[model samples]
Target: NDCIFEVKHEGKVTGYACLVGDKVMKPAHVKGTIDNADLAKLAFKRSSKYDLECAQIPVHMKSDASKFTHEKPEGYYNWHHGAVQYSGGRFTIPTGAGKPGDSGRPIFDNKGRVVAIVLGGANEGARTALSVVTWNKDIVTKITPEGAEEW
Candidate 1:
């Protein structure tokens, strides 16, 4: 499948991992799913490890300022950040909010090629989701006219 990714180079790539997606049997649980519900929450947190860690570095020494607008004051910082803490409050789903089943779903680019996978919404607002996919120039050699062809 054709998958797209945005560039965000960190230290380096030591290895790669494979992910599996499944269809949710219950849609109603998507909304009420809590951190302690299932092992799912751990998966979600692990998927967003980069963002969570980066966000928690203390916007400033004593202040709680953040780079992303969602974590700033007047914003829904409570929901956005609190969700990470296993709170029971409702977090604001951003504009592109996708339900629970949306997890592990492949994301595509304008060309309809899969570029990423939808994790979930950010705690702050609706539709603020994160994608585990990130650009890797080393993989360009694999994209083919058929979309994603490994040579």
Candidate 2:
């Protein structure tokens, strides 16, 4: 089953964790018969004790915010430092919005490119601030895959 756990670094809460392929076996088994032993071994080999995977998944990071524009067909206008306003009563609770665990949360562009990582929010279910992914290019590059396929 997929699970969510607290992510911590240097004795501080970061964010919640989402494990990719956490329930791979369920779909795999439903599709067809497979070797359970081999699958179990594979899962064991890929297990990690760390909160964040050292070798991360693929990412398409965008640096220019000017190229990215927000559009709300209704009365809602996308303004606010980092918060994107959502109409139809949809609101976003920023990642760890007001807690010590407030970590970077990916904010994607309309084209699906990850443009920035939200660091904080101005209000509940409202405004927020953003930090472009390029700001931590060095660390991001070091952690993510070199040439992985896009999702």
Candidate 3:
């Protein structure tokens, strides 16, 4: 978890939320999951038995843009204006405003591009993990991760 965040801060557009993931055995009319292992196969089609646990999804979020500071107190330590880390792969963030609710939300970069999906986590120095797992839109020509969908 090297902090890939830069020193700059600010944003315009953003995105996420809504459920998809979990296990509930025994027959049921509806599933937390929409069957698409074929999709599993394809995404992992070139893998080693899909070594990592995997799945796919469709998420719809309210697009009304909001604002968040990039360097604002990077997590549950001290709310200081430190150079907000923008680590590669994953990075942590500051929590407070409905902390738990931060889960299932999308984290955006300065350009308003989705840098990662919220994992709402930890690691020294206010490090709260968020996965920068963006996706491919062509599952077909298509493609996506975790929360109500948190498996």
TM-scores vs. true structure, each candidate: 0.27, 0.27, 0.31
Candidate 3 TM-score over all chains jointly: 0.31
Residue-pair clashes per prediction, in order, are 18, 0, 15
lDDT by residue (tens digit), candidate 1, 61-133: 2121111111112223222122211112222334434343343333333232333323344433433334333
For candidate 2, which ten residues in a row score worst on lDDT?
25-34
In Å, residue 94's CA in model 3 sits off its true spot by 3.5
Regions of model 3 farther than 4 Å from truth: 1-84, 95-98, 123-125, 135-151
What is the Cα-based TM-score of model 1? 0.27
Q: Residue 148 of candidate 1: its Cα lDDT?
A: 17
Error of 1 at 89 (Å): 28
Q: Is 1 or 2 the stronger prediction by lDDT?
A: 2
Task: Give RMSD to native, each candidate.
Answer: 19.4, 14.6, 14.7
**Model 1, residue 66: what's the lDDT?**
14
Order of candidate numbers by lDDT, starting with the best: 2, 3, 1
**Model 3, 14-131: lDDT tens per residue?**
1123221221111111112213332213221122221121223212211322323323223222112222344443344543322432333444545443333342344333444433
Predicted model with the maximum lDDT = 2
